[PDB]
Amino acid sequence: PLSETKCTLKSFTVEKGIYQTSNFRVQPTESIVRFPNITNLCPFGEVFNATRFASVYAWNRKRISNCVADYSVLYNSASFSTFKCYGVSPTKLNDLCFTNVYADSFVIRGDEVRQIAPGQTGKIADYNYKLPDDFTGCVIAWNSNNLDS
Amino acid sequence: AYTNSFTRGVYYPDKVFRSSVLHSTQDLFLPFFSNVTWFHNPVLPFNDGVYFAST
Amino acid sequence: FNGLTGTGVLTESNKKFLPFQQFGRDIDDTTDAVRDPQTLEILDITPCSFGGVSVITPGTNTSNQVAVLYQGVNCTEVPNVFQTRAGCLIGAEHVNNSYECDIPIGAGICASYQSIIAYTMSLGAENSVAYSNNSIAIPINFTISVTTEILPVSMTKTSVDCT
Amino acid sequence: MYICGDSTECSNLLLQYGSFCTQLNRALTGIAVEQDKNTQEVFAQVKQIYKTPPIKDFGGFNFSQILPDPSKPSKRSFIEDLLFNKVTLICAQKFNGLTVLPPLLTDEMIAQYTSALLAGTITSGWTFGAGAALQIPFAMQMAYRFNGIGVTQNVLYENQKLIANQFNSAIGKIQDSLSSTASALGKLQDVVNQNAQALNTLVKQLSSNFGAISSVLNDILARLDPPEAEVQIDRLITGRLQSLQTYVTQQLIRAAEIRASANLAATKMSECVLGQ
Amino acid sequence: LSSTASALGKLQDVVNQNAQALNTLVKQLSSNFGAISSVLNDILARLDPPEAEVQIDRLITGRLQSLQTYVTQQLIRAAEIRASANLAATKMSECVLGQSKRVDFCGKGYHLMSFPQSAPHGVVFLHVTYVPAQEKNFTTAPAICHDGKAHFPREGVFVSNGTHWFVTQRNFYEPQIITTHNTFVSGNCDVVIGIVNN
Amino acid sequence: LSSTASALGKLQDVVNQNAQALNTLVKQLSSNFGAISSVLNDILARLDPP
Ligand SMILES: *[C@@H]1O[C@H](CO)[C@@H](O[C@@H]2O[C@H](CO)[C@@H](O)[C@H](O)[C@H]2NC(C)=O)[C@H](O)[C@H]1NC(C)=O
Ligand SMILES: *[C@@H]1O[C@H](CO)[C@@H](O[C@@H]2O[C@H](CO)[C@@H](O)[C@H](O)[C@H]2NC(C)=O)[C@H](O)[C@H]1NC(C)=O
Ligand SMILES: *[C@@H]1O[C@H](CO)[C@@H](O[C@@H]2O[C@H](CO)[C@@H](O)[C@H](O)[C@H]2NC(C)=O)[C@H](O)[C@H]1NC(C)=O
Ligand SMILES: *[C@@H]1O[C@H](CO)[C@@H](O[C@@H]2O[C@H](CO)[C@@H](O)[C@H](O)[C@H]2NC(C)=O)[C@H](O)[C@H]1NC(C)=O
Ligand SMILES: *[C@@H]1O[C@H](CO)[C@@H](O[C@@H]2O[C@H](CO)[C@@H](O)[C@H](O)[C@H]2NC(C)=O)[C@H](O)[C@H]1NC(C)=O
Ligand SMILES: *[C@@H]1O[C@H](CO)[C@@H](O[C@@H]2O[C@H](CO)[C@@H](O)[C@H](O)[C@H]2NC(C)=O)[C@H](O)[C@H]1NC(C)=O
Ligand SMILES: *[C@@H]1O[C@H](CO)[C@@H](O[C@@H]2O[C@H](CO)[C@@H](O)[C@H](O)[C@H]2NC(C)=O)[C@H](O)[C@H]1NC(C)=O
Ligand SMILES: *[C@@H]1O[C@H](CO)[C@@H](O)[C@H](O)[C@H]1NC(C)=O
Ligand SMILES: *[C@@H]1O[C@H](CO)[C@@H](O)[C@H](O)[C@H]1NC(C)=O
Ligand SMILES: *[C@@H]1O[C@H](CO)[C@@H](O)[C@H](O)[C@H]1NC(C)=O
């Protein structure tokens, strides 16, 4: 403690008195994690497997809840191309526990794929489908040149 | 048959527990000392929420 | 707890919840009571001890040993222990005498060299004047004393530019 | 602790802002150490500690309402008890680093100082401030105090009973005024309210977005990439620094006037009680 | 004063505070403040006006906050120094140029006079004070009545060494025989408490 | 009093100081502060929200 006092006073001589050096914290151990009892596979697999899509004038809306969502298996897949996930991290999807999930699926042309992003205008962006000024999940797009082509 | 609903329409806004604290909140509450349209099977408007007191 | 990450020490809570709450709080936002998602009970959260550290030294020139005081936590989890009303100090021998004392600590307890002893300060010498309604005390001799005091009037004049 | 709650890389980012963690602590330490000298200067003016004699022959005056009472928790008198009741072990700490330090001078020694001063004034006149205590009857002290304002000393020695009765009635009348009027102490309550509201505002300002995504560090840290979370961890430190600086500045400004009032009170105690 | 040092604590504290404040201010000039480097010449030399301005803005705002804090602290310290100077001026004007009757203003006891002396950044006073000692206690009496007339003392107090009565001043022991030159009559000795025959 | 001027130094100095402080507070409204324009009415209607 005398060495700490000499450090905090930046001198080799200290006069009689009471001095403050630092503060301490009790190190916590034995971390605990709790979770509910829900146990059922989620139908997002059939959402992504099945490809019967619509277009912009009528975009499908699906509700995803009461699942055990696994994004790591989809993340490592090379079938899809663009993740570019805003808000939450693409790799940190498995350590935060969500409240509700919204799914939208449709088909768009290749010159407007970049137009689907918050805080920007365009032609099909500002007139047909706007993303709000805050984070809303993220968007995944992939090339299909054998079904609708 | 208008009636003065004095101080009815107070509900817990959130699923949180508090104690001995004066909490200021903002939500769709029924204004105090309002007038309610007594009725007696007509279609009625639903603006943003209906306080359906009944006997 | 279901995405709620928090540090603290848990205890069997004594407060009561209505069947529709999930967690309580207090002034501002201090989550204290939480309901577990599986076994359906209630546990309250309180901080574990923390505080600053103080060192009492009698001067390097005089001696080369010091005392360590912990403000906040009391000496139950700190891995010549003495407990006071303001933290606890280790390294000082408690005595049962009162002296007009050196370096103060707090709540009337003050420690000084003698080998670093901590005690309760004494206000001063106690005497009782023998009051009476039929006697007065008159001085017979007088002395002339000289007293000094220092007062500052100004400091250095400094100017600082911007560009 | 207040700015970066139990986080590591938050301290790493804070280390790039110079040393904006020590001067605030130094100023607060100076305020705390000065608040001890403020109390030490006023009361600690008598060298010894006198106590009242068992003799209660004061010529007619009744001082039992203000002298210390042995059958009390801290040997306090009636007026001190009334004053204490009219103003509204170690667990004090939060998740913010708010700490309250106990004063050096406990209430018992303050009461002892006041009792010593009262006993010296009663049983030694005004001679206990210059040299040593010189016992003298109370009646002659009152006569000299009358003589010091122009009125001759033969007025008191022939109207002693009337003055004793008037003083007793005046002493008795103050208890009702203190007990009934709850708005008498309008000067010892403003500072407490101001300090409490300032601290409440300081602790309440934490839950603010400040333009970031969330007002809590842990939730942001567990969601964003550290390569990208650098900007979002920022815009939060820069506001808390401003809040703390404003609080410290206001504390200094309001402590200056308290110190001035303490100096005035010390002057009043030195000049009006020890002498005339 | 020659040998015992450390009695000039106030001036040393003021000088140390000023020096520490200035040192901290000059030391604050060497932080990144979120930029790339702590010197603007390097940033200008390694970059171009297109984007070199952001780091410059960060450095400017940080230095501006530091300067503002230093100025505020200096203002507070100057106000305190002004208050101390006012107190010193009042003391010098009232005690040096005259005599003080208020208790415990200049010195500890009955004030006599003072001498001022200079200092590196202040002033030092040398008060001369009067203090009694060698006390002796006697048997007193408020007033003495002769021939039914209650004489009171003009200025002083009645005392007795055991057999005789004298009148003496308050702050010294100079016995004087009781005569009609320093005692005045008022009424009759039937209402005063403490009347003693003489 | 009626002949010598500048005798009311303290009051005039206080009034001048207060007026100067208010004036220099008012003047700060037109500073660019690093934006694209000093006034806000045009800046809100000229650029996109981002
Ligand atoms: C449709 O869902 C099934 C179910 O997971 C996927 O089947 C996997 O296919 C790969 C490659 O053929 C196999 O290596 C796995 O073992 C299969 N898993 C299971 C559980 O059978 C299939 O890939 C999905 N189809 C598309 C187009 O994504
Ligand atoms: C020191 O801290 C310990 C930790 O709790 C205190 O222990 C308990 O304190 C509560 C109230 O503070 C008492 O009601 C309990 O009886 C205490 N338990 C025990 C086993 O002592 C302790 O009181 C604190 N103070 C001291 C002097 O030890
Ligand atoms: C004053 O007269 C009294 C009479 O004896 C003496 O002072 C007191 O002496 C008693 C002796 O029992 C002590 O208990 C008291 O404490 C004394 N009073 C004090 C110290 O105030 C003494 O003879 C006379 N005083 C002097 C200085 O000679
Ligand atoms: C204090 O004064 C009282 C009264 O003036 C003195 O004592 C009185 O003496 C007479 C004798 O002439 C008695 O009749 C009274 O009863 C006494 N009264 C009291 C209260 O004692 C006394 O001598 C004086 N001094 C002291 C020390 O009491
Ligand atoms: C001096 O005043 C006190 C007041 O506390 C008197 O003590 C008693 O006070 C109560 C409540 O005020 C009264 O009802 C009693 O009559 C008081 N006297 C007693 C003996 O109990 C005390 O008596 C007063 N003394 C003198 C000499 O006036
Ligand atoms: C009190 O003082 C008086 C005056 O000083 C003393 O009276 C003197 O006593 C001596 C004793 O031998 C005589 O020679 C003197 O003539 C007396 N003085 C006068 C003026 O006559 C008295 O003795 C003292 N009493 C005590 C108890 O000390
Ligand atoms: C002072 O002397 C007078 C007269 O010598 C005293 O007055 C008389 O005292 C006696 C004895 O107590 C009484 O019987 C008389 O009634 C009193 N009056 C008269 C007219 O004779 C007086 O008491 C003495 N006082 C003192 C304090 O000694
Ligand atoms: C309801 O409306 C009627 C019509 O204006 C009004 O007279 C009455 O006071 C209202 N009731 C209230 C305000 O409680
Ligand atoms: C959750 O599951 C565990 C283990 O199967 C069980 O002990 C617990 O009671 C369950 N919680 C419920 C049913 O609320
Ligand atoms: C150390 O302390 C001793 C005793 O008080 C004193 O004589 C000596 O001068 C001190 N030395 C220094 C360097 O202060």
From Swiss-Prot, chain B:
Changing residue 55 to I: In strain: Iota/B.1.526, Mu/B.1.621, B.1.1.318, Omicron/BA.1. Glycans are attached at residue 35. Attaches the virion to the cell membrane by interacting with host receptor, initiating the infection. The major receptor is host ACE2. When S2/S2' has been cleaved, binding to the receptor triggers direct fusion at the cell membrane. When S2/S2' has not been cleaved, binding to the receptor results in internalization of the virus by endocytosis using host TFRC and GRM2 and leading to fusion of the virion membrane with the host endosomal membrane. Alternatively, may use NRP1/NRP2 and integrin as entry receptors. Binds to host ACE2. RBD also interacts with the N-linked glycan on 'Asn-90' of ACE2. Cleavage of S generates a polybasic C-terminal sequence on S1 that binds to host Neuropilin-1 (NRP1) and Neuropilin-2 (NRP2) receptors. Interacts with host integrin alpha-5/beta-1 (ITGA5:ITGB1) and with ACE2 in complex with integrin alpha-5/beta-1 (ITGA5:ITGB1). May interact via cytoplasmic c-terminus with M protein. May interact (via N-terminus) with host bilirubin and biliverdin, thereby preventing antibody binding to the SARS-CoV-2 spike NTD via an allosteric mechanism. This is Spike protein S1. The gene is S.
Swiss-Prot record, chain D:
Residues 160-210 are annotated as: Heptad repeat 1. The record marks 76-77 as: Cleavage. Changing residue 221 to F: In strain: Omicron/BA.1. Disulfide bonds join 4-10. Residues 189-233 form a coiled coil. It comes from the Viruses. Glycans are attached at residue 62. Precursor of the fusion protein processed in the biosynthesis of the S protein and the formation of virus particle. Mediates fusion of the virion and cellular membranes by functioning as a class I viral fusion protein. Contains two viral fusion peptides that are unmasked after cleavage. The S2/S2' cleavage occurs during virus entry at the cell membrane by host TMPRSS2 or during endocytosis by host CSTL. This is Spike protein S2. It comes from Severe acute respiratory syndrome coronavirus 2 (2019-nCoV). The lineage of its organism: Viruses, Riboviria, Orthornavirae, Pisuviricota, Pisoniviricetes.
